[PDB]
């Protein structure tokens, strides 16, 4: 989408793999703001928008 | 046939959606309990 019309996407009730996301070679910024990236894959939440 | 969902006319903002595996003279009884504890 566009950054005036950005993409919100609500993802509940599964299971999110961060190290997926962390260990791949094709992110040149993946800056965590108020947690860390290692603690991410133990960590639950309500819910993630995307 | 079902053919006739008349039962809301908005979704606004949703916050959890779950599909699942259905439930379901008299010939069946069927016994439910819904319980609200701590969320
Ligand atoms: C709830 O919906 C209304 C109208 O659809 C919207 O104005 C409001 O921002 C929404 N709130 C949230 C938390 O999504």
Redesign the interface.
């Given at each position: 989408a566009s950054v005036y019309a950005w993409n919100r996407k609500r993802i509940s009730n599964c299971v999110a793999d961060y190290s997926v996301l962390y260990n791949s070679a094709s992110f040149s910024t993946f800056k965590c703001y108020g947690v860390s990236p290692t603690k991410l894959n133990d960590l639950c939440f309500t819910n993630v928008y995307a | 046939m079902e053919s006739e969902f008349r039962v809301y006319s908005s979704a606004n903002n949703?916050?959890?959606?779950?599909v699942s595996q259905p439930f379901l003279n008299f010939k069946n009884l069927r016994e439910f309990v819904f319980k609200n504890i701590d969320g």
């Open positions: - | 949703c916050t959890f959606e779950y």
